[PDB]
Every structure is written in structure tokens, then in C-alpha cells.
Design a binder for this molecule. Sequence first.
Ligand SMILES: Nc1ncnc2c1ncn2[C@@H]1O[C@H](COP(=O)(O)OP(=O)(O)OP(O)(O)=S)[C@@H](O)[C@H]1O
Ligand SMILES: Nc1ncnc2c1ncn2[C@@H]1O[C@H](COP(=O)(O)OP(=O)(O)OP(O)(O)=S)[C@@H](O)[C@H]1O
Ligand SMILES: [Mg+2]
Ligand SMILES: [Mg+2]
Lengths: 322, 432, 432, 432, 119
Amino acid sequence: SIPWIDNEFAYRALAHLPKFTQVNNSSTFKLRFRCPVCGDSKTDQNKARGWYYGDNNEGNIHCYNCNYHAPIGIYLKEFEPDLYREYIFEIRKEKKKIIKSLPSCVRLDKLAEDHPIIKYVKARCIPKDKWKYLWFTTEWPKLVNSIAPGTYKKEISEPRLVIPIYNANGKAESFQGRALKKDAPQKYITIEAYPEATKIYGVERVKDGDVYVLEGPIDSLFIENGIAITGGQLDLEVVPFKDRRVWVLDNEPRHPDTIKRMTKLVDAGERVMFWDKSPWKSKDVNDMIRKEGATPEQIMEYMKNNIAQGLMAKMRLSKYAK
Amino acid sequence: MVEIILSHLIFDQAYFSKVWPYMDSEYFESGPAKNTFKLIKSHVNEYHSVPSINALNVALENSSFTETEYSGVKTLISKLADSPEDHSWLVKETEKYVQQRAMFNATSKIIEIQTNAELPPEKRNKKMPDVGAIPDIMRQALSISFDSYVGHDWMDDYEARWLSYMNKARKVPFKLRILNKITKGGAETGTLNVLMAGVNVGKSLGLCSLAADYLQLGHNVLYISMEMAEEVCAKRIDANMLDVSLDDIDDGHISYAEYKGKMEKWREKSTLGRLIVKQYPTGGADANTFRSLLNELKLKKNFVPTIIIVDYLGICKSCRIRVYSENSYTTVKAIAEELRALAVETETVLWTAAQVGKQAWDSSDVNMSDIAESAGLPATADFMLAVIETEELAAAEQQLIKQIKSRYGDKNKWNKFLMGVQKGNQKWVEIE
Amino acid sequence: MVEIILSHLIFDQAYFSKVWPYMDSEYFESGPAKNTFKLIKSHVNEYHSVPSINALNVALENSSFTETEYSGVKTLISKLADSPEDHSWLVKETEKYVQQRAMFNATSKIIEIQTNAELPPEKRNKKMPDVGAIPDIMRQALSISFDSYVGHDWMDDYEARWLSYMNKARKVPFKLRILNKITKGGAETGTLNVLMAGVNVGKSLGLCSLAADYLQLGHNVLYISMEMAEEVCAKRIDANMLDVSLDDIDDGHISYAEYKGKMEKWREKSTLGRLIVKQYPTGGADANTFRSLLNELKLKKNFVPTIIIVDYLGICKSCRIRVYSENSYTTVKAIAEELRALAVETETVLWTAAQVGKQAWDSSDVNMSDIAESAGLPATADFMLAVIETEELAAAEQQLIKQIKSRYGDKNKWNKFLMGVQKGNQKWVEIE
Amino acid sequence: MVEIILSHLIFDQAYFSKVWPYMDSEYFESGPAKNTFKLIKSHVNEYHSVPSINALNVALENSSFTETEYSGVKTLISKLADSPEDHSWLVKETEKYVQQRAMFNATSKIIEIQTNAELPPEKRNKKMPDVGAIPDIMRQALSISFDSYVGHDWMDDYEARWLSYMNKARKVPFKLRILNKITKGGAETGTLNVLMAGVNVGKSLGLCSLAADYLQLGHNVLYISMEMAEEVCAKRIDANMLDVSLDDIDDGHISYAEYKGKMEKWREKSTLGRLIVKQYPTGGADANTFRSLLNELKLKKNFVPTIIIVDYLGICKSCRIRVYSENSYTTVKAIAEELRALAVETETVLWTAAQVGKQAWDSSDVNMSDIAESAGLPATADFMLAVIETEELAAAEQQLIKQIKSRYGDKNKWNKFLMGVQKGNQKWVEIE
Amino acid sequence: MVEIILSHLIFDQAYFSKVWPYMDSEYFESGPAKNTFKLIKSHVNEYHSVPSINALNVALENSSFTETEYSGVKTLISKLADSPEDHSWLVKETEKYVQQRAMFNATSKIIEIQTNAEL
DNA sequence: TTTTTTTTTTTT
DNA sequence: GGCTG
Ligand SMILES: Nc1ncnc2c1ncn2[C@@H]1O[C@H](COP(=O)(O)OP(=O)(O)OP(O)(O)=S)[C@@H](O)[C@H]1O
Ligand SMILES: Nc1ncnc2c1ncn2[C@@H]1O[C@H](COP(=O)(O)OP(=O)(O)OP(O)(O)=S)[C@@H](O)[C@H]1O
Ligand SMILES: [Mg+2]
Ligand SMILES: [Mg+2]
């Protein structure tokens, strides 16, 4: 199939659909739109559950509301025949911004001990020395609009934990907001300054030895040589230290997405970490420390012993899957 | 060393002719190397020649590939270059790489097998081999060397053939000299031997007698009975070997002391094999069931039989056939073919039984055209025998055997030999 | 599961004596479980008895463990209870646990062997087994089973087999002296027995007589009728048991008082079994519907039968054949095989009846050749009794029973015998 | 691949001869490729010879285009190199490229015709064809290829057919004078030949005798066996070739000195071929399995067979029909068609054997209607012989080979001819 | 009263002998109840006996359940207890509950049938 | 689960 | 604020 002509043609077809957004990262092409078949959600007028994925072999449209799933060619044949004509004919035809300052953000180590966010991060049991890698704000939409304007229409004051991300050079290129309130648009709001920014927290703090890669930036604070991808593309390539990285995810043996990521990592021949002999039962290392009384150096003891690679990692995954 | 392998496949005729027939797509990776080898294999299949760089990157690479796959294949093809290396080191390194990759694939396959079998039924991914056939996969992966062994050359392999002749490493001799003088040394390993007697004429007295003789000859015997329980077959074997009448064991004329004494006297002999009797419901056992039974015996009891005796071929079921057929010709022929395939796979002499036609009942002679279930069964059998004791041989405790089909020798040489049946002891004795 | 295994090793005897020989340290863990099992094994080696909790704690106190190991072992020891689980589930579950752990250990060992093999030859461990040992190692993982029972092992089960011949474990008596004489103690479990009725003989009279005789001997009887309703078959049963003539019930000679009195007199006797009569339409009951009926009776009625009597084999339907013919040979052969398979898999005595050949109808003597079902019934039937009713026998209220096929004993011992048939009470009485 | 096409037009010669007539300027492009091809065509029209690179530069200089494209054309002629690719792949790829471009041009033309038809007649173009011409021109694009011959013409190709009569190029002699006489030169290549006989009559004997005779005539013979082992077939061949009876081998009447001496005496002959014996499970090999076997035989050794002896086609499986989906007739017809397709593809003489019906096992005459399994096998076969053995014939060591079907001659001239059969030596001798 | 039914299936024998052949998986809600009954039914089919609490906790661990399903089943198993009552009210209450569940399933099925017909 | 063609086989 | 096969 021809992917780029599908991306070009799909865009115009889905451009007519309302709530049209171009979810284009550095390696994928997706289009978000309201589904034209069902009108998406009747109760929520602002939901766009129709999606187009063009990074595969064939660009396919999938609706998460009415379970419509089709190729772009069938979509064009059924709904846009004038666009379908040229589509098959063209088919036959070919067949950086740096965060220099953080306004209204105060670092946690220079804050007073009676601050309510200090009580929360003490309840999260972060060690004190990591407190100079964390900021706090009350004007998070104002801060984001100071960095990337236009994403927040109204700058209502929201207290959020600032999580600046530095490169190997140590320059801040993105920042993540942890939601202090239980009610929020998102638990982790990642904001980039330029679209090719690194999404791996704390790359500047990597020393010699094995590099442990986790899922949470707060989880990496207990870990020596601990960095954390903030979702995004989850690209192993964009992740450095490929010869010596350690792939640590959250402890969830019955969760299908976690074992899907484990299978993707172990089929790539990577060094994946396994919780199959863990004395603790919590989902993440921070939850293990907070709820099961675990101290960090026991955890530094367990993982190093159970580091796995390749075929022996496969059996570990076979028994950890269920 | 995928790059070197591909480069010397493209740019070396001797290396190609040496290593190509042993190449497989499951050896390189799940990325650019596999796609490049797929292109090369498609070109070689289509044109019977090694492709060039132009054929790879123009005539073949313009195919249904992903952007990432296209870029990887382009980089790998551009990276291919001829390098001067000795054509004894290249072949050995390629052989080592192939062996390592075969072992890796086998390990992954057995891991997947264990993971699948751990799951509960209705999600067990049928057609995937059971946990029992893990060691055979590893053994196959071990023997993945680059040696040319396709068939038996007549002139190039006469030494091994003469070794087989002088050792006679196919014959399993009988305990009866009459059955050895017509088979020229007994039955052969990968063979299907059949008895045809009728109704209540024999056909299990003979099989039990053969099992007893093989047991006395030190062979491991597996008696798979479809029509009789394990206890009754073992009682017939006890009557044969303990020289006690079958009625005496029922009325109670034999004491426990002498029974145990005879059993222990047989035990102390080093020239005694192991006989294992297994019963299956009539019509509920196929060749796959027999293979599962063999694997279970080998794993648990460390029992590898040399003789397999199926009490009745016509009351089994076909593993290949999925829908039962009212046509007895095809079903019985398929059953016999599957049984003979099992025999030649396990190198075990397979004896079975067949039913004769009603016309042959009370007939002084039984021809091969008296076979009842199927005419394809005599075609697949290596040796058939017919029991024709009608009325007078019964009064003289005799049975006449005709030798209807003989693949071990000429069946017209000693067609009849008038075997000495004994139904009380359930055995055959000669008339020497 | 490890907690349960250790707890029932400490607090049980049969479980210990059953699972201890198959218990190894490497099967448990690398933490508290392994240390606890090492303590148990050390105690049982030094003192040949199962340790108690206080003794286990004393051994833990006098042992070389670190702080974390001490805490783990103490917690695990404090977490063991004498709770009572069922033995079969416990043994099966611990067998599965042991097998899974052995498989995991073997897979890890072969992976480590492969990893060591791909290392500089100057630099590798000597103790690690070579790659060629991989197929054997997995075999040792697959050869782990708490109890090995694959078939009947001759010379290894002779003591158990003798207990079968003395205890007549398989025989089911007949309540008729002549039938016990020719069967050497009655019919056997897992068998198909049929009656051949000549012209002028009913097939359901003999079956009802056998059902009544088995009922009087304490056996659970399941009578499956095809051409008759449940009430009619149970009326034949009442005629035989209550001594009331069949026509007397319809006429009304016997009143409710006598009927109820006789029924309660039978109910008082403790030597009486249960009879369950189930009706099925003609051709609407294959030998797979009978399995469902047995499952329903076991689950709901708790009725597990020892005798199953099918009214007529010809009326039944061949599940394998699927298609149904009023009088076709292929169906009768399949029906017989399916019913015998049901009898074998249910360990029950199965009875049925068939009509003899027309020539057999005219001739007082009936030959296996003279049978409507040829090579189909005298091949899948352990016993085939033939019933002859001529004019002279009917005038004397008798029927000539001829033995046409006897897997049990010699067919010619007592072949012909005269039976005292009463057609009114549907009964068979002996003749002096 | 326009660069490759242009480069091999300028430099390669045989490719130019084969591909130039099927070349048009519309097949290449509308840019630099079209201009370069126009220059080449103009030069070849002026001077009836292929131009050179310097000639192309001179033509560009004297015959100029607009510089915009002229730069692209001059940079297009900077990459045409010799690049000695194989001829078959180059021709096939050029044919595929021109076919694809012809399809594209035809689709564009029909689209333009449809667009013109929609336009009002006032302004519609006159050069464009009408809509009624859309189908035929499409056909003109469908039948585009480099095959100058579409079939065989009787009068046009009278030459190149007389060559096939002077040099047979199909006949393979039989080494037996009677078979050559009844065949007029022996069996032909790309044919299916069948020996039909009853069970245990000599079919494998005849096939082994034919294989030995072919081997003595410097032929590569591949014996594929579905029933017998490789050693058994090789023993039959040894008995035929080494003049030693089968009984001698199984009785030890031949020494290793005689065996090795005779084998080396046969090896010293320059008129001896190769005999590879291959074994497959009964019902576990098809035509595609045979093709894979031939490919691996050609790769792993310098072995390309001229004779292929399949032991019995009835015990093979079809490569199209799923297993036991169809009856015997359809499956056997499909297998015969697949085998004949393999024979015509490999240009080899394929011998095989077939069974006769149950009614012909004891008959002195065998007709074509006596064929077992399909009746389409005689239809698909090219030469069928019936082997008949009776008591009188067996008493004289002779058989009654009868012509059932013959596409090589009249079956009535010599229909039945006696043949001496040495079963001990597994040899066919002719009565003289 | 699904919890009572499960509790007296596990901890009582006369109740189990009386009510087991008529129980079905469709009589329980799709939450923890149906999964717990599935575990009990599988254990009874495999071992022909009523499982204990330890057996079910072993069966739960050796099961392919999501985190929510696993937590629900474990909580329901923990909540089970042998409340002493009479074996004449339990049987009739279970029969009433089974009849109500059957009626509910039939009503849902006929509603689905009517919705399917109009398509 | 029936229905219809054709074949091949076998049983009576 | 994303999520398919
Ligand atoms: N308990 C016994 N006592 C004496 N003779 C027996 C006994 N059982 C069988 N026989 C004899 O053994 C022969 C029966 O053959 P078997 O070995 O049982 O096999 P088969 O009965 O021919 O097989 P089918 O299919 O059941 S007819 C007859 O000659 C019987 O007289
Ligand atoms: N191994 C052997 N030893 C001695 N004589 C044999 C042997 N094999 C075959 N014969 C003789 O050769 C005859 C024909 O055998 P083959 O030609 O192999 O038979 P076929 O045509 O393959 O049919 P089958 O396999 O016997 S049904 C036999 O009947 C014997 O007389
Ligand atoms: Mg028998
Ligand atoms: Mg043969």
C-alpha cells in the first residue's frame, strides 16, 4: 500500500468532519474527528472518538463509539465518491525552544516546611535531596500559556506540581504537570516547548552503570540512574543507553496493556524487569514504599538480582503473564 | 553475522551452492534481514539463480513494504559488499550461526508450548504440540548441520546396506521355527502384520500367543486391546505362560502359592521382557491416541516397546478422517495406513487382527478375497495370515494357516503348515 | 499453594506418605519456602518422623539464617494450619505445582546451557552440561508424576490381578443357575450382551426377566425403552416381581390393596435395587443421549447404574452413522460399537436384543451365519444368547436357549438348554 | 527500472534483439526517459545499429531540446553501465514493466475517451476515439508480451517439427526388446506409466526391474516409496543387479568380498547412472513434496532425475483436494493429474503402480474396468500394463503382462505377452 | 441472596446435594458472583466434591482474571461465612431466587428478540 | 439435518 | 485524553 497518499487524502475527507485535530508526532500520523456515521456521543457534543491511523501499512479509520473500522479507500468509496475517483487515480498514477524560566513556579527545596504541598510530597515519601528537581505552581494554565500560548483559553488558577524535563545537556525542553486535586482534566499533563523535545525525565542525572527506565518521573526519584519516559511515542530509539538500559514498568501481572508492552520489549531483545518474585504487591515502587513499608535499598537489591534478557526473560514473562 | 551471510550469498557461487539448500527464513531476525532473505528466496525460486544488487533494489524491493521496512532493506542492501574470506571458515561460521538460531527458535517454541498448555481448555490453541513432544523438538534442533543426506544412494551407501544385511537389523525372530522359516528370520521392524480368523476362531489367541513368545524373547510388548479388558488379556497371557488352563484360573484349581512361585520364577529370568496391556473403548482410539500412549509410557514408565499388538484393526478410528463414513473400505484402509505409519515411525513390529467374510465361515479354505472390512487392508499389510480350522482340526486341536500375503518371502513355498492350537492354555505349539 | 503443601506435610500422614518421595528443595522457591522445606527435610532425615511446630521453631532457632531469612521463616511457620482438605484434590494440586516448577527449572537450565555454549571456549564453565544433554534434561522434567498407572503391567501387577480372579471382581451373577454355569459366574462389567430372538419370540420378555432378576439381587438397573412407554415396561416388571399376570392388571382382577401390599413387602426387603425406566422415540436415541441421561441421573437422582438394558438395538440410532435406516447392517454394527464403548466407559453390564435371520427363524438351530446382523453383532458382543421357540416348546411353555457367541467361556460347553418361559408373568424359570 | 532497460539496450546485444521490436516511446515516461529512448530510436533508425554513449552525447549536442529537460536528459545518460545481469530475469522484468505501462496507458486513454464523450459535440476533440472503441483497445493492452509464438502452426512450423522426428528427444528405451517393440522406442518424457496388478502380485517387482534396467542405461532414477523402506527397495535392486537371490541375502550365502567386488565392478562401468531411493509415509507426500524433493536433490547434489518411479500413487495425497474431502474417484484422478503435470514440467518418465479391484484378485484376465479407486487414472495415464499371475503361470515362473492402454502404439498388435519373472532376483526376463 | 447461596454451597452438604443440579451460571450477576460460581463449578466438575476456601483461593490465583475481577472474587470469597439457619427456608428461598433470575433472563431475551425483529 | 448427482465398494 | 483490529 501507499501510506503518504492515504495520509494526504484521509486528511481532506476527515477535514470536513467537525472536531478535526491533527495528532502528528515525530513518527506517526493520526487524525481525530467526530464520527460521521453515528454523530459520535449524543450526550457529549465535544467528544471526537473517530480516529485515522496512517502510520501502519494501510491507513485505517476506526470509530470508538459505533465500532466502525474501515480502510480509507472504503471510506472514500462509501462517503466521498468525488474524492474517491482522484484517490484511486493518483493511486494508479503512482502504481528548538528551550525553557529558560518558570514564571510563578517555586522549587520545593526552597519552600517552607508548613506548605501543604510539602505535606503531600512527604506523604509521597520522596527523599529530601530530590526536592530540588521539583517545582510547584498555582497558575499552571498561565505557565503553559507563557511557554506555549493558546492551549489554555482561560487561565484559571490550578495548583499543579511542575515537572521540568532536561536533556543530556541539562536544558529544559518540556515540563509535566501532576494534578494535586483528584478532579482534573488529566493526571499527567505533558507540555512541550518544541515538538521534538525529549520526553525522558532526568537524562542529565545518568551516571555510569545500568540505566533504569521507569514509567513515572516520581518513581524514578527513588532510583539511582533512574529516568522515565513521559508516554509520548515511547520510542526505544529516542531512548539513549540502548546497550545498557533497564526496562522497568509497573507491577501489574493481570493487566493486558502492561504485558503487551512487556511482549513488545522482550521481542526487541531488550533488558526487561520482572516482578514475579517480588515480596511486595503494590502497582508501582512509590506505592510499594508508601503502603507496604518498603525502603529503597531493598528495591535496589531485588531488581538487580532479577534483570532478564531474551529467552530466560521470555519464560519469566510466560509465568508472570497469569 | 547476517550481513556476511547475505553478502557471500550474493557475491560467491561456491558459498551459495554450499549453504543455500540449508537456509531458512526463520534464522535471521524479525526485521530487515528477514525481508532481504525473503527477496533473495523469491528471486531464486522464480529464476533459479542468485540475484544481483540491481535485482534486489529495483526488481524486488519495489513491493508491499512499510516505510521502516523499506528503509531497513535499502540500508541492508546498500551495506552488502564482497569481502575476501576463506571458504572453510565462512561455511563453519555459517553452520554455527544456523545451529545457534535453530536452538533459539526451538527454545522459544517450547516456551510457547508450555505457556499454551498452562492455559485452561477452550483457549488451548489446537494443532500446537503438547508438552510431551518438547524433547523431540530440541533433538531436531540439535541435528541441523549442513550434511547432504537425501535418500539412499545405491552405489554410495552400499556399506551401510551390507551392515544392515549382516547384522539383520530389521528382523524380530519368532519363538516358532515354522514362522521363522517362512519369514526368513521373523517379522521386520516397520511392518504391519495381520491375522484373519473369523468369529470365535482365534484372532486373539494368536495375538496373545505372539505376545507371550515376544515376552519370552526379551522384547517389550504393548498390547492395546479394544474388545477386551486389561485383566482378561493378562489372564490369557498368564494361561499361556504359566501352563495353567484358562478354566482352572476361573474355577479355582490353582492356588496362590504356585501362582506366585511361577511368577517369581519368570521374574528371576533375565530373558524376559515387559508386557503392558492398555484397553480403550471400542471405536475410541486412533493413531494419535496410540502416539500419546507411547509418549506417556516412555516418560512415566520408561517403556519403549519393540512390539505393538492392536487387538483389532477394524474397531479403531481414523485420525485423519474427521467425519465418520459408512463406507468401510475407506475407513479401514485409512486406519491401516495410519497404523503402518506409526509402526515405521516407531520402528516397532505391529501385529493386528482382521475379520474374514461370512462366506469364509466354516470354509475349509480362505482366500484373500474373503477379507471383510476393506480390500485396501491387504494392500497395506506386510504379512497376512489366515486361520481356517473348520471342524476336524478342532477335534484334533489343530489350526491351518494359509499365508495369504507374504512380503518377507514367497507365499507359495510353505502355504500351509497346520499349527497346533491349544485353546485351554491359549497358545500355539508346533507339530514338529 | 506452597503454604498448603507445607502445612499438610506437617499436619498429615497419608499426604506425607504419598508425596514425600517426589518432593525436592528446588521445587519450592529461593526464599522462605525453600528454607522452611530445608528445615523439614533436615528434621525428617535426622529423626525419621514429621516435625511438629515447636520442634520446627527450635530447629529454626538453632540454625544459620540472617535476619530477613529468620523473619520470613518465622512468619511462614506461624502461617501453617491443620485445616482439613480433601486428599484427592490436594494430591492432584501438589502434583501440578511440582510439575510446573520442574518444567520451569528445566527450561531455565537449558537456557543457561545455551547461553554458556555461546561463550569463548577458553572461557566457559566445565560443570555446565553440553548442549546435547538438553533433550534428556527436559525428559527428566516430563518424567514427574506422583502416581504412574499407564495400563496393566504384567509381572508388576500380578498380586492385584490375582485378587481380581479370587474376588471375581468383574462378574455379575444372573440368579439363574444355568446362565451362571455357562458364564463362569455371570456377565462381566464393561460388556455388551445381546439376545437373538427367532420367529415367535419377544425381545422384551427376556430383557424384563433379566432386569427383574438384577433388581432382586440389589443392582441399580436403567431400562431404556424405544418401542414402549415407561408404564408398559414397568408393568412387565410388576408382572414378573408381583407374580401377577400381565392380562390380570388390564382386566382388573388384582385390586389396589393386594398391589400396594406386595409393593410394600418388596420395599421392606433390603436386598432390592432401584429400577429407572426411561423412554425415547424410535430412532431418537443414540449412544450419546444415553451418556447425557446417565449424567442427569447421577447429578439429580444420584442414580449410578450397574446394569443398562436397551429395549432393542435395531430401533436405536448410530451417532457416527447419523443417518437412520429401519433395518441396515452398517447402523447395527455402529450401534453395537457405540453401546459397547458406553458399557466400557461406564463399567456397567449392557444388555440388548436383536432378531435372528429369516433362515434362522425357520430353522430351530441358529448359526452365527444365520443372523440378521452378520459380522456386526458377532464381532462387538461379549455374549450372544439365542432363543428358539418352536411349536412343541411353546406347547410345553419352554424356549430353547442356544449359545451362539461366548467371550466369557467355551461356547460348546453347554450350548443348548431349555428355559421355562412364562409369557404371562414375563418370567424365565429354570428346568430340572 | 528504466535505467536498466536503457543501459542493456545500449550495451547488451541479445537482450536488444529480443526486446527492441516490443518497444514504444509511450512505455517509458514523459520526461528524461522518453527523450533518451527517442534519441536511441532515432539513432537506430538512421544507422541500423545500437548507438554508443559518445554517440548519445553527439546526438544530444546536434539534436537539442529545451535546457530545462536537456539537463535532466544529460544527467540521465551518466549511469548506463554494462552490469551483466542474467538474460531471463532481465527479459521477464522488462516484459512486466511494459505490460504495466501499457495497462496504465490504456486506462488513461479510456478515461480520456469517457471525459470527451461527456463534453458537448461543439467543443469535443476529434482525434479521440469513440466510446465503442474502449473494449477492443483494452484487449490490445491485455495481449502484450514478448512471446512471438502463441501456439503451434501446422504449415508454418513444419520445420522444427521434423527435427523432433529425426532426433526423438522424447523416447527412452526400455532395455527390454519386447517393451521397445510394443512401445516403438520406449516410454516418452512427460508421461504417466502405470503397472496394474493384484495384491502381492509383482508391481514393486516390475518397478524395481524397470529401475534397474534404466540404471544400466546410464539414467538418473529416483525411486520414491510410500510403503517399503529404502533398504528393502535397495535390496530388490541389489538382487536384480548383483545376480544374487533374495534368499541368499537373508540366509548369509553371499560374502562381503563378493558384494563389494560386484558393487565396484558396477561402479567401474561408464554406462551406469544414479539411483536415489526416497521413503515417505503412506499418504504423507504429494506433487509439491516431490517438487521440493527434486529441488533439494538438485541443490545438495548434482542429481537431476530422468526417471521417477513412484511406488504406488493410490497411497499418495492430492496437493489440491483437502484430505478425504472427496471420494476415491476424484482424489485419485487429481493425484494422477498432478503426477502427470510434474512429469511434463520436469520432462521425465514417471512410472507408478495401481491396484486392481477385489474381483480381479483371482482372475486369469484383467480388464481396464478392474482398476481400483478412480476410473480417471486410465484416462490420465499414457501407458498402462496389467500384470496377471495364476497358479499355472506361477508354476513356471512367468506372468501375463497385458496392454490395457497405449498412447505409444496399437494395443491389439501384441496385447498379451508372457514374461519370465524371477521373484528371487526380482527380475523380468523375456522369453526367447 | 447470592452470597448466602455460595456460602451454603461451600459450607453445607445437604443444601449442596439439594440445590446444586439446578444451579446455573446464568442465575448470577456478571460481577464477582458469576466468576465465583464458575470457579466452584469447575472445581466440582474436575474433582466431584465441594471446594473449600483454600481450594478457591488456589483456583483464583490460577485464573485468567483482570484486576477488578480478581479483587471482586477475592472480596466475595473473604465475605463468605457459614450462617446457621434452617434447611427448609434456604431451599425455598433459593428456588424463589432462581425462578426470579430465570424470569429476568427471559424478559431480557424477549426484549432483545423484539429489538432484533424490527431491524 | 436432508438432497441430489457419480463413483466404488460391500453385503445379501 | 487518549484508547482499535
Ligand atoms: N475362557 C475360555 N475358556 C476356554 N476357551 C476359551 C475361553 N475364551 C475363549 N476361548 C476360546 O478361544 C476362542 C475365541 O477366540 P478369542 O481369542 O477370544 O478371540 P475372538 O473371540 O475370535 O475375537 P472375537 O472378535 O470376539 S470373535 C474360541 O475357540 C473359544 O472357544
Ligand atoms: N521381501 C521379499 N522377499 C521375498 N520375496 C519377495 C519379497 N517381496 C516380494 N517378494 C516376491 O515378489 C512378489 C511381488 O512382490 P512386490 O512386487 O513387491 O508386490 P507389490 O506389487 O508391491 O504388492 P504388495 O506390496 O505385495 S500388496 C511377492 O508375492 C513375492 O513372491
Ligand atoms: Mg477376539
Ligand atoms: Mg509394493
